[PDB]
Amino acid sequence: SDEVIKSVDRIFTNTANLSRDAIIHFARALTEVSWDEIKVPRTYSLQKIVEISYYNMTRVRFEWSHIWDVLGEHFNRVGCHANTAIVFFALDSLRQLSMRFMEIEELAGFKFQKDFLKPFEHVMSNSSNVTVKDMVLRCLIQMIQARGENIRSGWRTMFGVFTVAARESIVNLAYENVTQVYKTRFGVVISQGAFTDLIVCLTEFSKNMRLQAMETLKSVIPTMLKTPESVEEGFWFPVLFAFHDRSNALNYFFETLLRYGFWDILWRQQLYPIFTTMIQALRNMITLFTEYMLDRFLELLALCICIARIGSNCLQQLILQ
Amino acid sequence: TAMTNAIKVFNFKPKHGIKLLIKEGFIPSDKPEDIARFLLREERLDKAQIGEYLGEGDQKNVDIMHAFVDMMDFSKKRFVDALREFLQAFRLPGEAQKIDRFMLKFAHRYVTGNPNAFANADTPYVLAYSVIMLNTDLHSSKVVKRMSKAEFIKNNRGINDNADLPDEYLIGIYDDIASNEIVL
Structure with missing residues (x-):
C-alpha cells in the first residue's frame, strides 16, 4: 500500500523533530519492541533503530547523549545475544553508524565518542564467542x-576494547593493530588524553602470559620512553601495577627499575613493590641513589623486612651498601 | 573620516555587513582570528545579530566563533562568573542548535582554561544548561510554581561522570542565580 508505507516511513523520518521527553519514550518503545522481536527472528526494528540514529546525528548533543543512554543499552543487549547472524548485523551496522558519527567534529576534552563507542567494549567484555570478538575487532580496525x-x-x-581483547587469534590481531596505531598516530593518541589508555592496553598485553608478551614487553617501556623527547609518572604506574603482578616480566620490571637512575608521589607507590625475586628490586632501589628527605623513610623500608633468614642476610648487606 | 556607517550594515545583514567590512578599515585578513578580534573589541554592533552570526552552522562562522570563544579567558575563575562573562559578550540566539554550538565551546574553553574543576568537559556543559534553565526559571514570574534548591540538586544528580557534584558548589551557583539575573 502506497499511503501506508509512506506514513510508516514518515513516522521515523519525523523523529528528528520530536522533543526530548518524547524522543526518549520513542527510543524506549523501539528498544522494547526490538528486544521482543529478537527474543522470539526478524531485525526490522533494529534497522529502524539504526535509521533513527542516522536521523538524530544532528540533534542537540545532550539530548543525543540521553537517547544513546538507551539505544546503546539495547545494542549491548543485542550484542550479548546467542544468534551469531543478528550480532554480526548489529555490529556491522554500528560500525557504519560510527563512521557516520565521527564526522560530528567533537571538541577536544569531551567524551561523546567515548560513550558512543561503549557498546563495542560491552560486547567485548560480555560475549563468549571467538568470532564475535573477531568481528568487533575487524569493524574497529576498519574504523581506524x-x-x-x-x-x-x-x-x-x-x-578499552583492545585491552579487554587482551584475553584468549584475538590477541595477535589486537596487538598488531595497537602496535600500528602507536607507531603511526602517537601524537594524536597523546593529544586526546589517550596516553593512559594506550599504556594500560600495552601493559595488559605484557601482563598477559602465554611471544606476543615479550614483543609488547619490548614495545611498552623501551620504544615508548624514547618518543616523548603525568607522561612519566603515569607511565611508571602501570609498569608497577602489571610488571610485578610470568617470571620474565617480573624480572624485566627489576632491570627496568634502573633505566631512569614528584619524588614524594613516586615514593608513595614505591612501597607497593616491597610491602622472592624482590631482593633484586631492593638492591636496585638502593642503587637508585646514583636526597636527604629520602633517608627519612629508606631505612624504615630497609628495616621493615626483618625467607626471614635470607631476607635479613640481604638486609645487612644492603644497609652496609 | 569614514567607516562610521560601515558598522550599521552588519546590524541587519550579517554576511553582507562582514563581506563589505573586510575590504576597508580594520580586519587585515579574512582569517577567523582578526574578525573575532574586531567583533569582540568593537561595540555598536547588535549583540543579538553577532550571536546569530557566530552561532551559524557555516564552517567559516564556526571557526570564527572558536576564535571568539577562545579569545575570552576563564582561567582561575568561578563557573558562574565565567558563564556571566561568556554571556556578557554577545546575546545568544533562540535556536537550539545555535545555543548548543555556543555552549559546547564555552564548556571546552572553561575546561581548557580552568582544568580539574570538573572530571570531564561534559560536566560544565550540562551544568551550563542547568544554570541557564535555572536563571530563566527563577527570574521569571510567568509561572506560579517556584523552583527550589532540592529539586535543582535532584535535577543535577550524577552529571560529572555519573557522580554527583559537590553540594556546596550547587548551593553557591543557586545563590549567585538568586543574587541577580544574567542579562544581555
Whole structure:
C-alpha cells in the first residue's frame, strides 16, 4: 500500500523533530519492541533503530547523549545475544553508524565518542564467542583505516576494547593493530588524553602470559620512553601495577627499575613493590641513589623486612651498601 | 573620516555587513582570528545579530566563533562568573542548535582554561544548561510554581561522570542565580 508505507516511513523520518521527553519514550518503545522481536527472528526494528540514529546525528548533543543512554543499552543487549547472524548485523551496522558519527567534529576534552563507542567494549567484555570478538575487532580496525583522522576524544573506550581483547587469534590481531596505531598516530593518541589508555592496553598485553608478551614487553617501556623527547609518572604506574603482578616480566620490571637512575608521589607507590625475586628490586632501589628527605623513610623500608633468614642476610648487606 | 556607517550594515545583514567590512578599515585578513578580534573589541554592533552570526552552522562562522570563544579567558575563575562573562559578550540566539554550538565551546574553553574543576568537559556543559534553565526559571514570574534548591540538586544528580557534584558548589551557583539575573 502506497499511503501506508509512506506514513510508516514518515513516522521515523519525523523523529528528528520530536522533543526530548518524547524522543526518549520513542527510543524506549523501539528498544522494547526490538528486544521482543529478537527474543522470539526478524531485525526490522533494529534497522529502524539504526535509521533513527542516522536521523538524530544532528540533534542537540545532550539530548543525543540521553537517547544513546538507551539505544546503546539495547545494542549491548543485542550484542550479548546467542544468534551469531543478528550480532554480526548489529555490529556491522554500528560500525557504519560510527563512521557516520565521527564526522560530528567533537571538541577536544569531551567524551561523546567515548560513550558512543561503549557498546563495542560491552560486547567485548560480555560475549563468549571467538568470532564475535573477531568481528568487533575487524569493524574497529576498519574504523581506524577509514576515519582514523577524525577520531577525537573517542580513543578511550576504543583502546578499552583492545585491552579487554587482551584475553584468549584475538590477541595477535589486537596487538598488531595497537602496535600500528602507536607507531603511526602517537601524537594524536597523546593529544586526546589517550596516553593512559594506550599504556594500560600495552601493559595488559605484557601482563598477559602465554611471544606476543615479550614483543609488547619490548614495545611498552623501551620504544615508548624514547618518543616523548603525568607522561612519566603515569607511565611508571602501570609498569608497577602489571610488571610485578610470568617470571620474565617480573624480572624485566627489576632491570627496568634502573633505566631512569614528584619524588614524594613516586615514593608513595614505591612501597607497593616491597610491602622472592624482590631482593633484586631492593638492591636496585638502593642503587637508585646514583636526597636527604629520602633517608627519612629508606631505612624504615630497609628495616621493615626483618625467607626471614635470607631476607635479613640481604638486609645487612644492603644497609652496609 | 569614514567607516562610521560601515558598522550599521552588519546590524541587519550579517554576511553582507562582514563581506563589505573586510575590504576597508580594520580586519587585515579574512582569517577567523582578526574578525573575532574586531567583533569582540568593537561595540555598536547588535549583540543579538553577532550571536546569530557566530552561532551559524557555516564552517567559516564556526571557526570564527572558536576564535571568539577562545579569545575570552576563564582561567582561575568561578563557573558562574565565567558563564556571566561568556554571556556578557554577545546575546545568544533562540535556536537550539545555535545555543548548543555556543555552549559546547564555552564548556571546552572553561575546561581548557580552568582544568580539574570538573572530571570531564561534559560536566560544565550540562551544568551550563542547568544554570541557564535555572536563571530563566527563577527570574521569571510567568509561572506560579517556584523552583527550589532540592529539586535543582535532584535535577543535577550524577552529571560529572555519573557522580554527583559537590553540594556546596550547587548551593553557591543557586545563590549567585538568586543574587541577580544574567542579562544581555
